[PDB]
Design an enzyme around this catalytic site. Structure first.
Site, short mmCIF file in Angstrom:
data_model
loop_
_atom_site.label_atom_id
_atom_site.label_comp_id
_atom_site.label_asym_id
_atom_site.label_seq_id
_atom_site.Cartn_x
_atom_site.Cartn_y
_atom_site.Cartn_z
N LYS A 117 52.66 42.22 45.25
CA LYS A 117 52.18 40.95 44.72
C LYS A 117 53.15 39.78 44.82
O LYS A 117 52.73 38.62 44.85
CB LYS A 117 51.73 41.12 43.27
CG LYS A 117 50.72 42.24 43.06
CD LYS A 117 49.34 41.84 43.54
CE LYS A 117 48.29 42.86 43.13
NZ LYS A 117 47.01 42.67 43.88
N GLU A 201 49.44 32.03 30.36
CA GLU A 201 48.99 31.74 31.72
C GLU A 201 47.60 31.12 31.58
O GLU A 201 47.04 31.07 30.48
CB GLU A 201 48.94 33.00 32.58
CG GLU A 201 50.29 33.67 32.79
CD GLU A 201 50.22 34.86 33.71
OE1 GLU A 201 49.14 35.21 34.11
OE2 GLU A 201 51.25 35.42 34.01
N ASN A 236 34.50 49.11 40.29
CA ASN A 236 35.33 48.27 41.17
C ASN A 236 35.05 48.51 42.66
O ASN A 236 35.92 48.40 43.52
CB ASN A 236 36.80 48.50 40.88
CG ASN A 236 37.17 48.13 39.47
OD1 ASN A 236 36.60 47.21 38.88
ND2 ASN A 236 38.12 48.84 38.91
N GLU A 276 40.55 36.88 49.73
CA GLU A 276 39.71 36.87 48.55
C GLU A 276 40.05 35.75 47.56
O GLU A 276 41.20 35.58 47.16
CB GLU A 276 39.78 38.22 47.84
CG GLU A 276 39.36 39.40 48.70
CD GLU A 276 39.49 40.73 47.98
OE1 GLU A 276 39.55 40.73 46.74
OE2 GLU A 276 39.52 41.77 48.67
N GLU A 289 43.81 37.55 46.72
CA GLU A 289 44.57 38.47 47.54
C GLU A 289 44.18 38.43 49.01
O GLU A 289 43.06 38.07 49.36
CB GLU A 289 44.42 39.90 47.01
CG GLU A 289 44.93 40.98 47.95
CD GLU A 289 44.15 42.27 47.84
OE1 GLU A 289 42.91 42.22 47.77
OE2 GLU A 289 44.79 43.35 47.82
N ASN A 291 43.76 40.63 52.42
CA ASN A 291 43.49 41.97 52.96
C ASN A 291 43.68 42.09 54.47
O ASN A 291 43.25 41.22 55.23
CB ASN A 291 42.05 42.37 52.66
CG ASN A 291 41.86 42.84 51.25
OD1 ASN A 291 42.68 43.59 50.72
ND2 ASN A 291 40.77 42.42 50.62
N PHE A 349 26.16 54.65 36.17
CA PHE A 349 26.10 53.84 37.40
C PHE A 349 26.83 54.52 38.56
O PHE A 349 27.92 54.12 38.96
CB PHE A 349 26.69 52.46 37.15
CG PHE A 349 26.04 51.71 36.02
CD1 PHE A 349 24.84 51.04 36.21
CD2 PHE A 349 26.63 51.67 34.76
CE1 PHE A 349 24.24 50.35 35.18
CE2 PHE A 349 26.03 50.98 33.73
CZ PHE A 349 24.83 50.32 33.93
#
Ligand SMILES: CCC(=O)SCCNC(=O)CCNC(=O)[C@H](O)C(C)(C)COP(=O)(O)OP(=O)(O)OC[C@H]1O[C@@H](n2cnc3c(N)ncnc32)[C@H](O)[C@@H]1OP(=O)(O)O
EC number: 6.4.1.3
Lengths: 668, 180
Positions: A117, A201, A236, A276, A289, A291, A349
C-alpha cells in the site's frame, strides 16, 4: 508476424478464451491440466496438452517447476497465465524470463511496484490522482479532533492508531459528535487492547465501486477504456457488473480516464490492467487501488468498445504498438454481465455445492447474448476450484434492452445437476433500485437483511403460475391416453370435458378448473380466466407458453405421480402439488405421520477398511461433499454428506475397520 | 388355480392395502408384482400371537410382516408407497407400461423425445481408475425417454438395478449392475 505457439497456464473459461483467440490468430495453443481436468473443455480445444499434476492446484497449476518442463517440452514461445494462479508470482516470471520465454502480463517491476500500500499511495500522489490527506499525528486533546477536521474537510472518521474491528471507531459529520466520538474512544479504548491513541481521516458515504481499464504500450503509450460499475457483490467477490456505469458523464469519464493513465505511465505499466476508484454520493472520485492482471470483468467492456483484449495483449507482448488511439474509443451501446456459480444462494449468499452436470444448454439462440463457459455436459464441479459455471454477457442499444435480454437469457439457461444462483441474478436485475441505478457496494446487504428468500409472486403472477402448472399437468394426463390402436382391444379415450384440480402451493390451496380447446387451455383460477397457449412439447427442457398474451418461459424439473411438480418460474423453483378433486377430497383422511430427518448422522453403507477421512471436527461440509472413503474388494466406496454445516465428531479414523451401519462421522 | 392359469397370459398385479393373514398371503406370491403401503399393510401367515406361543421370540406386527421388512429385507414386496392416495396414483402410472395380454406387443405411446439425440453426459461417467465407483442410474436416466425411470425394489438387492422405461415410445425393461 506473431507467435507460433503459446502455452496457457490456467484452466476453464479463461483458457478457452485464449485458445479461441489464438485459433483466430493462427497460433497453436498448449494447455496444461491436472489429472481430474484431463477431460475439461480447454484441454480438448487446445492443440497440445501436458498433464502437470494431481487434483489439488498447489501441485498442478501452482507447480512452476513442472510447468517450466511443459513449456520447454512443447517448445512454447510465450506463456499467458490468465489470472489467478501465477499471474502475480514473481518467482515464476523470473525463472520463466531466465529461459527467454516471453511472458504475457506484467513484468516483475509492476508486480513489485504495487506490492504493498505504501508504493501504491505514493504513486497516486506523484501521478496526482487524489488520496485525500488524513492527520499525520495523534489526536490528544478534545478540541484537536474538530480543529484538524475543519482544516482538511467535513465527513471525518475517528479510528484507532492501530487495530480494527470497531476498536473505538465512530463516524462523524459535524463538530459536536466529532468531539464526543473522540473523547469516548480516548477514554474507553484503553480498556480493550491497552491503546487509546486516536487518528482522524476522511470518509465517503454510500460508495460505488467503479473500475477503469488501461491498455499499456511497450513504447510508452497507454489508453483508457470505458469504465465498469461493479457494486453488486457478496463475500467480497463481484457477481454482476455493468460497463457504461451511470454515475459518469462525458467529462467525468475523461477526467478519471486520464488519471488512470497517469498511474500506468509512471510505473511504465506496459500491460493490461485495471484501476479502481470509489465515488461518493456527490460524484467525488477517490483512488483505491491499481491491479495488474486481466480482470474477470473484461468480457463486458469488450461489448461496448469493440476490442479483443487477448488479441491485443498478445501483439503487445510480441512488441507491436497499440493499434488504436484514444479518439476511437467510445461506448457503442450497453452491456451487463452476470457470473453464474455452482452455489446455493440461500445459505448465507452462495455456499458451494458439489456435483455433476446432467443437463446443460446455453442461451445462444437469443439476440445480444454471449456465453463464455469453460464447461460441457458431463463436467464435474468440485471443492478444489472456485465453483464457476459460466459468465453470461448481454448487450443492447440501451439500458432497458440489455436488461430485458439478460432476463430472457437467464430463463432460457439450463443448468441441472448442481445448485446454481440464477434465482438471485434474475431477481436483482429486475429490482427497482437496480433499474434506476441506486446501487451501492452494500446493495445486497440492505435488500436481503435476513438472507435470500427467492422471487416473491404478486397476485397476477400467482395466477399465471397456477394456470401454467395446471395446464401442464393436464397436458401430461392427455398425452398418457394416446396409444397406438390395438386392433384386438379397442381403446376408448375418456370424454373429459373439464379437469377439476386442487392445486396446493406453499400454504394455500387454490381451486382451478381447466378445459382443453386444442393447443390452448382455458383455465379458471379462483374465478380469474386465463388462456395458456403453447405447442406443449413435453420433452424439451424449455417450455415456451403464452398466458393471456404474456410470453413466459418455464422449466419442469421433476414430476411425480402423486401430483408433485417442480416448476421453475422466473428463476425460482416452486413446489406445487396438483391433485384431482377426488384425490384431494379423500386425502384429508390420511394420517399426517412425520419422520425424523437424520441427515447429520453419516453411517457406513458398506463394510470394509477406512482409507481416508477428509475431515476433522470444525471442518466445513458442503452438500455432496466427500467425507469418508471405505475400501473393500479393492474399490473406493465414497461416502458423502447430505447436510451443509461443520463436523461435530469424527468417529472412525483411517486404518480402522468398519461394518455396515457403523457410525463414521457426525455433523452439527 | 386361476392365478397359476393366468401366469404368462395376462399381467397380474396385487396391491396390499392392509393386513393379510392365512392362505390369503399366498396370492401375491403367484401374481407378477406385489406392492404395499407403508405402515398400513402387512404380509404374514401367522401373527405375533402364534410366534410367542410356539417359540420364545419377541416380535411386533410391523417387525413380523410390515411393509418395510418385505421391501427392504425379505425381497417379497416390489415397492411400498407412503399412503393410499399416492399408492394408487403410482399404480395408474405403472399400469401404463404393460400390455393387456401376452399376445400383444409392448405398448407404444406418443413420444416427444427425439430418438436421434446424443447424450454427451455419458462420455465421462465411467472412471479410468478401476477402484472408483459410479452411479449406474445416471446412465439409465440419460438414455430413457424424457428421463423417466420406474425403479423396482429400490431398497432390496441394491447391487442390481431393474425397472421399466420407454425408448422412442416403446416400453422396455432395463437390467444393470450398480458398482456402488
Ligand atoms: C392359515 C389359515 C388361512 O388360510 S388364514 C387363517 C385365518 N386366521 C387369521 O388370520 C386370524 C384372524 N386375525 C388375524 O390374523 C390378525 O389378528 C388380524 C385380524 C389380521 C389383525 O388385524 P386387526 O387390525 O388386529 O383386526 P381385528 O383382529 O380387530 O379384526 C377386525 C374385525 O374383523 C373381524 N375378523 C378378523 N378376522 C376374522 C376372521 N377370520 N373371521 C371372522 N371375523 C374376523 C374381527 O372380529 C373384527 O370385528 P370386530 O372389530 O370385533 O367387530
Amino acid at each position: 508476424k506473431t507467435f507460433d505457439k503459446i502455452l496457457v497456464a490456467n484452466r476453464g473459461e479463461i483458457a478457452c478464451r485464449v485458445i479461441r483467440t489464438c485459433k483466430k490468430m493462427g497460433i497453436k495453443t498448449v494447455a496444461i491440466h491436472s489429472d481430474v481436468d484431463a477431460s475439461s473443455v480447454h484441454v480438448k480445444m487446445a492443440d497440445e496438452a501436458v498433464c502437470v499434476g494431481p487434483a489439488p492446484t498447489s501441485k498442478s497449476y501452482l507447480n512452476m517447476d513442472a510447468i517450466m518442463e511443459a513449456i520447454k517440452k512443447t517448445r512454447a514461445q510465450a506463456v499467458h497465465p490468465g489470472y489467478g494462479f501465477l499471474s502475480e508470482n514473481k518467482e515464476f516470471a523470473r525463472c520463466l524470463a531466465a529461459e527467454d520465454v516471453v511472458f504475457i502480463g506484467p513484468d516483475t517491476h509492476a508486480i513489485q511496484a504495487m506490492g504493498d500500500k505504501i508504493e501504491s499511495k505514493l504513486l497516486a500522489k506523484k501521478a496526482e490522482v487524489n488520496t485525500i490527506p488524513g492527520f499525520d499525528g495523534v489526536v490528544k486533546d478534545a478540541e484537536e479532533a474538530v480543529r484538524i477536521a475543519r482544516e482538511i474537510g467535513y465527513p471525518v472518521m475517528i479510528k484507532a492508531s492501530a487495530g480494527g474491528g470497531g476498536k473505538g471507531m465512530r463516524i462523524a459529520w459535524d463538530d459536536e459528535e466529532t468531539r464526543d466520538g473522540f473523547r469516548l474512544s480516548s477514554q474507553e479504548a484503553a480498556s480493550s487492547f491497552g491503546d487509546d491513541r486516536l487518528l482522524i481521516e476522511k470518509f465517503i458515504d454510500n460508495p460505488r465501486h467503479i473500475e477503469i481499464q488501461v491498455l499499456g504500450d511497450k513504447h510508452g503509450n497507454a489508453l483508457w477504456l470505458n469504465e465498469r460499475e461493479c457494486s453488486i457483490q457478496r463475500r467480497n467477490q463481484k457477481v454482476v457488473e455493468e460497463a457504461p456505469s451511470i454515475f459518469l458523464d462525458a467529462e467525468t469519464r475523461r477526467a478519471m480516464g486520464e488519471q488512470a493513465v497517469a498511474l500506468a505511465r509512471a510505473v511504465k505499466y506496459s500491460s493490461a490492467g485495471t484501476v479502481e476508484f470509489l465515488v461518493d454520493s456527490k460524484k467525488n472520485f477517490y483512488f483505491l487501488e491499481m491491479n495488474t492482471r486481466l480482470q474477470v470483468e473484461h468480457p463486458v467492456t469488450e461489448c461496448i468498445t469493440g476490442l479483443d483484449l487477448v488479441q491485443e495483449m498478445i501483439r503487445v507482448a510480441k512488441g507491436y504498438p497499440l493499434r488504436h488511439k484514444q479518439a476511437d474509443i467510445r461506448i457503442n451501446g450497453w452491456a451487463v454481465e452476470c457470473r453464474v456459480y455452482a452455489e446455493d444462494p440461500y445459505k448465507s449468499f452462495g455456499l458451494p455445492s458439489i456435483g455433476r452436470l446432467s443437463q446443460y444448454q446455453e442461451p445462444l439462440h437469443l439476440p445480444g447474448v454471449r456465453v463464455d463457459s469453460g464447461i460441457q455436459p458431463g463436467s464435474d464441479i468440485s471443492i478444489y476450484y472456485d465453483p464457476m459455471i459460466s459468465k453470461l454477457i448481454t448487450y443492447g442499444s440501451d439500458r432497458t434492452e440489455a436488461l430485458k435480454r439478460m432476463a430472457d437469457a437467464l430463463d432460457n439457461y439450463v443448468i441441472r445437476g448442481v445448485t446454481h444462483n440464477i434465482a438471485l441474478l434474475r431477481e436483482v436485475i429486475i429490482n427497482s433500485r437496480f433499474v434506476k441505478g441506486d446501487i451501492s457496494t452494500k446493495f445486497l446487504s440492505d435488500v436481503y437483511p435476513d438472507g435470500f428468500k427467492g422471487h416473491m409472486l404478486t397476485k397476477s403472477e400467482k395466477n399465471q403460475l397456477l394456470a401454467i402448472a395446471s395446464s401442464l399437468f393436464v397436458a401430461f394426463q392427455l398425452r398418457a391416453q394416446h396409444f397406438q390402436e390395438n386392433s384386438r382391444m379397442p381403446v376408448i379415450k375418456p370424454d373429459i370435458a373439464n379437469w377439476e384440480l386442487s392445486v396446493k402451493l406453499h400454504d394455500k390451496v387454490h381451486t382451478v378448473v381447466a378445459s382443453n380447446n386444442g393447443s390452448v387451455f382455458s383455465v379458471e383460477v379462483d374465478g380469474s380466466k386465463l388462456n395458456v397457449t403453447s405447442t406443449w412439447n413435453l420433452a424439451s427442457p424449455l417450455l415456451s407458453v403464452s398466458v393471456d398474451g404474456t410470453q413466459r418461459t418455464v422449466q419442469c424439473l421433476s414430476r411425480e405421480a402423486g401430483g408433485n411438480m417442480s416448476i421453475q418460474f422466473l428463476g425460482t423453483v416452486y413446489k406445487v402439488n396438483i391433485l384431482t378433486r377426488l384425490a384431494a377430497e379423500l386425502n384429508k383422511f390420511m394420517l399426517e405421520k412425520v419422520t425424523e430427518d437424520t441427515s447429520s448422522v453419516l453411517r457406513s453403507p458398506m463394510p470394509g477398511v477406512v482409507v481416508a477421512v477428509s475431515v476433522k471436527p470444525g471442518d466445513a461440509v458442503a452438500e455432496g461433499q466427500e467425507i469418508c472413503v471405505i475400501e473393500a474388494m479393492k474399490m473406493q466406496n465414497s461416502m458423502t454428506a447430505g447436510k451443509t454445516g461443520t463436523v461435530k465428531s469424527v468417529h472412525c479414523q483411517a486404518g480402522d475397520t468398519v461394518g455396515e451401519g457403523d457410525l463414521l462421522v457426525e455433523l452439527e | 388355480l386361476r392365478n397359476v392359469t393366468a401366469s404368462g397370459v395376462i399381467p397380474q398385479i396385487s396391491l396390499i392395502m392392509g393386513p393379510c393373514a392365512g392362505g390369503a398371503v399366498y396370492s401375491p406370491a403367484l401374481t407378477d408384482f406385489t406392492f404395499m403401503v407403508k405402515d398400513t399393510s402387512y404380509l404374514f401367515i401367522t401373527g405375533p400371537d402364534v410366534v410367542k406361543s410356539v417359540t420364545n421370540e419377541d416380535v411386533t406386527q410391523e417387525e413380523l410382516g410390515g411393509a418395510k421388512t418385505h421391501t427392504t429385507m425379505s425381497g417379497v414386496a416390489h415397492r411400498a408407497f407412503e399412503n393410499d392416495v399416492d399408492a394408487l396414483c403410482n399404480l395408474r402410472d405403472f399400469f401404463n407400461y404393460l400390455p393387456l395380454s401376452s399376445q400383444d406387443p409392448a405398448p407404444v405411446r406418443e413420444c416427444h423425445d427425439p430418438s436421434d439425440r446424443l447424450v454427451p453426459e455419458l462420455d465421462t461417467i465411467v472412471p479410468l481408475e478401476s477402484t472408483k465407483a459410479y452411479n449406474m442410474v445416471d446412465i439409465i436416466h440419460s438414455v430413457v425417454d424424457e428421463r423417466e425411470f420406474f425403479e423396482i425394489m429400490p431398497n432390496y438387492a441394491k447391487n442390481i438395478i431393474v425397472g421399466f422405461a420407454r425408448m422412442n415410445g416403446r416400453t422396455v425393461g432395463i437390467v444393470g449392475n450398480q458398482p456402488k
